[PDB]
Amino acid sequence: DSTECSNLLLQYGSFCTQLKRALTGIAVEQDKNTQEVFAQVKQIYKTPPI
């Protein structure tokens, strides 16, 4: 809610991008983490009716 603060913030520059890339990598790994634990099955098998 402050345009005045935003203008001053650009001087650092790389700080916002580095934070977003780091947080983006954590996010993609969280998905790879659940596909290594549970996607060990090529096809979805089903139990018999009886």
Partner: peptide, 21 residues
């Protein structure tokens, strides 16, 4: 999360039926 709790639960069901059968 990309994999829904129902999708995370059909992976477990296939893992559980390949093992039993």
């Amino acid at each position: 999360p990309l994999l829904t709790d129902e999708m995370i639960a059909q992976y477990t069901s296939a893992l559980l039926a390949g093992t039993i059968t």
